Coordinates of C-alpha atoms in Angstrom, one line a residue:
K1 CA 12.4 -2.5 17.4
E2 CA 12.6 -0.6 14.1
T3 CA 15.5 2.1 14.2
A4 CA 14.9 5.3 12.2
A5 CA 17.3 3.9 9.5
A6 CA 15.4 0.6 9.3
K7 CA 12.1 2.7 9.1
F8 CA 13.6 4.8 6.2
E9 CA 14.3 1.5 4.3
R10 CA 10.8 0.1 4.8
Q11 CA 9.1 3.4 3.9
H12 CA 11.3 4.4 0.9
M13 CA 13.6 1.7 -0.5
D14 CA 12.7 -0.5 -3.4
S15 CA 15.8 -1.9 -5.2
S16 CA 13.5 -4.7 -6.6
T17 CA 12.3 -2.9 -9.6
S18 CA 14.1 -0.3 -11.9
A19 CA 11.1 2.0 -11.9
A20 CA 7.3 1.7 -11.1
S21 CA 6.1 -1.2 -13.2
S22 CA 2.5 0.0 -13.4
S23 CA 0.1 2.7 -12.7
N24 CA -1.0 0.5 -9.8
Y25 CA 2.5 0.3 -8.2
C26 CA 1.8 2.9 -5.5
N27 CA -1.5 1.3 -4.4
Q28 CA 0.2 -2.1 -4.0
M29 CA 3.4 -0.7 -2.3
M30 CA 1.8 1.8 0.1
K31 CA -0.3 -1.1 1.5
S32 CA 2.6 -3.7 1.7
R33 CA 4.9 -1.3 3.4
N34 CA 2.1 -0.7 6.1
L35 CA 1.7 3.0 5.1
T36 CA -2.0 2.7 5.1
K37 CA -2.4 1.1 8.5
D38 CA -4.1 3.8 10.7
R39 CA -4.6 6.5 8.1
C40 CA -3.6 7.1 4.5
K41 CA -0.1 8.6 4.3
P42 CA -0.8 11.5 2.0
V43 CA 2.5 11.4 -0.1
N44 CA 5.5 9.0 -0.2
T45 CA 8.5 8.5 -2.4
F46 CA 10.1 5.1 -3.2
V47 CA 13.8 5.0 -4.4
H48 CA 14.7 2.4 -6.9
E49 CA 18.5 2.3 -6.1
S50 CA 20.9 0.3 -4.0
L51 CA 20.9 1.2 -0.3
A52 CA 24.7 1.7 -0.5
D53 CA 24.2 4.5 -3.2
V54 CA 21.5 6.2 -1.1
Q55 CA 23.5 6.0 2.2
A56 CA 26.4 7.7 0.3
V57 CA 24.2 10.8 -0.2
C58 CA 24.8 11.7 3.6
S59 CA 28.4 12.6 2.5
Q60 CA 27.5 14.6 -0.7
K61 CA 26.0 18.1 -1.0
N62 CA 24.8 19.9 2.3
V63 CA 21.5 21.7 1.7
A64 CA 18.6 23.1 3.7
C65 CA 15.7 20.7 4.5
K66 CA 12.2 22.0 3.7
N67 CA 11.6 22.8 7.4
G68 CA 14.7 24.9 7.7
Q69 CA 16.7 22.2 9.5
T70 CA 20.3 21.9 8.3
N71 CA 21.1 18.2 8.3
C72 CA 19.9 17.6 4.6
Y73 CA 22.0 16.3 1.8
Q74 CA 21.5 16.3 -1.9
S75 CA 22.6 13.6 -4.3
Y76 CA 25.2 14.5 -7.1
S77 CA 23.6 12.1 -9.5
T78 CA 19.9 11.7 -10.4
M79 CA 18.1 8.7 -9.1
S80 CA 15.2 6.5 -10.3
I81 CA 12.2 7.4 -8.0
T82 CA 8.4 6.9 -7.8
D83 CA 6.2 9.6 -6.3
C84 CA 2.9 8.3 -4.6
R85 CA 0.2 10.9 -3.8
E86 CA -3.5 10.4 -2.8
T87 CA -6.2 11.0 -5.5
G88 CA -9.6 12.4 -4.7
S89 CA -10.9 8.7 -4.5
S90 CA -8.7 8.0 -1.5
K91 CA -10.8 7.6 1.8
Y92 CA -9.5 5.4 4.5
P93 CA -9.5 2.4 4.6
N94 CA -9.7 2.6 0.8
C95 CA -6.5 4.5 0.2
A96 CA -5.9 5.3 -3.5
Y97 CA -2.7 6.7 -5.1
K98 CA -1.4 8.2 -8.2
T99 CA 1.8 6.7 -9.4
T100 CA 4.4 9.0 -11.0
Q101 CA 7.9 7.9 -12.3
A102 CA 10.7 10.4 -12.1
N103 CA 14.6 10.7 -12.4
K104 CA 15.6 13.4 -10.0
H105 CA 18.3 14.3 -7.4
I106 CA 17.1 13.2 -3.9
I107 CA 17.4 15.1 -0.6
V108 CA 17.5 13.2 2.7
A109 CA 18.1 14.1 6.3
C110 CA 21.0 12.2 7.8
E111 CA 21.6 11.3 11.6
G112 CA 23.7 9.1 13.7
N113 CA 26.9 7.1 14.0
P114 CA 27.0 5.7 11.5
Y115 CA 25.6 8.8 9.8
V116 CA 22.8 7.5 7.5
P117 CA 19.6 8.7 6.1
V118 CA 16.6 8.8 8.5
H119 CA 14.0 10.9 6.5
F120 CA 13.3 11.5 2.8
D121 CA 12.9 15.2 2.5
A122 CA 12.4 16.2 -1.2
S123 CA 13.4 15.6 -4.7
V124 CA 14.9 18.3 -7.2

Protein backbone atom coordinates (compact mmCIF):
# COMPACT_ATOMS: atom_id res chain seq x y z
CA LYS A 1 0.00 0.00 0.00
CA GLU A 2 1.08 3.56 -0.71
CA THR A 3 -0.20 6.00 1.91
CA ALA A 4 -0.98 9.60 0.79
CA ALA A 5 2.32 10.71 2.39
CA ALA A 6 4.26 7.95 0.56
CA LYS A 7 2.50 9.02 -2.65
CA PHE A 8 3.47 12.69 -2.04
CA GLU A 9 7.08 11.58 -1.85
CA ARG A 10 7.03 9.56 -5.06
CA GLN A 11 5.20 12.29 -6.98
CA HIS A 12 7.06 15.32 -5.62
CA MET A 13 10.33 14.65 -3.77
CA ASP A 14 13.78 14.64 -5.36
CA SER A 15 16.63 15.32 -2.88
CA SER A 16 19.07 13.66 -5.32
CA THR A 17 19.81 16.80 -7.33
CA SER A 18 20.08 20.47 -6.25
CA ALA A 19 18.09 21.61 -9.34
CA ALA A 20 16.97 20.19 -12.73
CA SER A 21 20.17 18.91 -14.38
CA SER A 22 18.92 19.37 -17.94
CA SER A 23 16.01 20.51 -20.10
CA ASN A 24 15.23 16.81 -20.30
CA TYR A 25 14.86 16.28 -16.54
CA CYS A 26 11.03 16.34 -16.57
CA ASN A 27 10.66 13.85 -19.41
CA GLN A 28 12.88 11.41 -17.55
CA MET A 29 11.35 11.96 -14.08
CA MET A 30 7.67 12.05 -15.04
CA LYS A 31 8.23 8.58 -16.53
CA SER A 32 10.35 7.05 -13.70
CA ARG A 33 7.89 8.27 -11.03
CA ASN A 34 5.03 6.48 -12.94
CA LEU A 35 3.22 9.75 -13.70
CA THR A 36 2.76 8.85 -17.38
CA LYS A 37 1.25 5.38 -16.72
CA ASP A 38 -2.41 5.74 -17.88
CA ARG A 39 -2.38 9.31 -19.13
CA CYS A 40 0.07 12.20 -19.17
CA LYS A 41 -0.24 14.11 -15.84
CA PRO A 42 -0.56 17.69 -17.18
CA VAL A 43 1.57 19.53 -14.58
CA ASN A 44 3.74 18.34 -11.70
CA THR A 45 6.31 19.98 -9.40
CA PHE A 46 9.40 18.30 -7.93
CA VAL A 47 11.00 19.67 -4.74
CA HIS A 48 14.78 19.41 -4.45
CA GLU A 49 14.96 19.56 -0.63
CA SER A 50 15.19 17.21 2.36
CA LEU A 51 11.89 15.56 3.24
CA ALA A 52 12.37 16.82 6.87
CA ASP A 53 12.41 20.46 5.67
CA VAL A 54 9.29 19.94 3.54
CA GLN A 55 7.44 18.15 6.35
CA ALA A 56 8.22 21.10 8.64
CA VAL A 57 6.08 23.38 6.35
CA CYS A 58 2.96 21.76 7.90
CA SER A 59 3.69 23.82 11.00
CA GLN A 60 4.52 27.12 9.26
CA LYS A 61 2.21 29.70 7.59
CA ASN A 62 -1.47 28.58 7.30
CA VAL A 63 -2.94 29.80 3.96
CA ALA A 64 -5.86 28.92 1.70
CA CYS A 65 -5.48 26.09 -0.87
CA LYS A 66 -6.34 26.94 -4.52
CA ASN A 67 -9.70 25.11 -4.11
CA GLY A 68 -10.76 27.05 -1.05
CA GLN A 69 -9.83 24.30 1.45
CA THR A 70 -8.13 25.63 4.57
CA ASN A 71 -5.53 22.97 5.39
CA CYS A 72 -2.69 24.49 3.28
CA TYR A 73 0.62 25.78 4.62
CA GLN A 74 3.26 28.04 3.07
CA SER A 75 7.02 27.77 3.63
CA TYR A 76 8.81 30.74 5.26
CA SER A 77 11.87 30.07 3.12
CA THR A 78 12.15 29.61 -0.60
CA MET A 79 12.87 26.13 -1.89
CA SER A 80 14.54 24.75 -4.96
CA ILE A 81 11.79 23.36 -7.26
CA THR A 82 11.24 22.19 -10.86
CA ASP A 83 7.95 22.76 -12.72
CA CYS A 84 7.03 20.16 -15.37
CA ARG A 85 4.24 21.00 -17.77
CA GLU A 86 3.15 19.41 -21.05
CA THR A 87 4.17 20.91 -24.40
CA GLY A 88 2.04 20.73 -27.57
CA SER A 89 4.14 17.72 -28.60
CA SER A 90 2.75 15.63 -25.73
CA LYS A 91 0.30 12.94 -26.82
CA TYR A 92 -0.03 9.76 -24.75
CA PRO A 93 1.89 7.44 -24.65
CA ASN A 94 4.46 9.98 -25.95
CA CYS A 95 4.24 12.39 -23.04
CA ALA A 96 6.55 15.39 -23.47
CA TYR A 97 7.39 18.11 -20.89
CA LYS A 98 8.93 21.53 -20.54
CA THR A 99 11.36 21.73 -17.60
CA THR A 100 11.48 24.96 -15.60
CA GLN A 101 13.81 25.65 -12.61
CA ALA A 102 12.51 27.97 -9.89
CA ASN A 103 13.21 29.12 -6.29
CA LYS A 104 9.91 29.84 -4.61
CA HIS A 105 7.93 29.34 -1.41
CA ILE A 106 5.90 26.13 -1.55
CA ILE A 107 2.28 25.50 -0.44
CA VAL A 108 1.22 22.02 0.58
CA ALA A 109 -1.91 20.55 2.06
CA CYS A 110 -1.32 18.67 5.32
CA GLU A 111 -3.27 15.89 6.95
CA GLY A 112 -3.02 13.22 9.63
CA ASN A 113 -1.26 12.11 12.79
CA PRO A 114 1.55 12.64 12.14
CA TYR A 115 0.48 15.84 10.39
CA VAL A 116 2.45 15.71 7.14
CA PRO A 117 2.17 16.90 3.49
CA VAL A 118 -0.21 14.89 1.32
CA HIS A 119 -0.73 17.20 -1.71
CA PHE A 120 1.45 19.81 -3.43
CA ASP A 121 -0.79 22.84 -3.96
CA ALA A 122 1.10 25.77 -5.50
CA SER A 123 4.31 27.77 -5.37
CA VAL A 124 4.52 31.56 -4.75
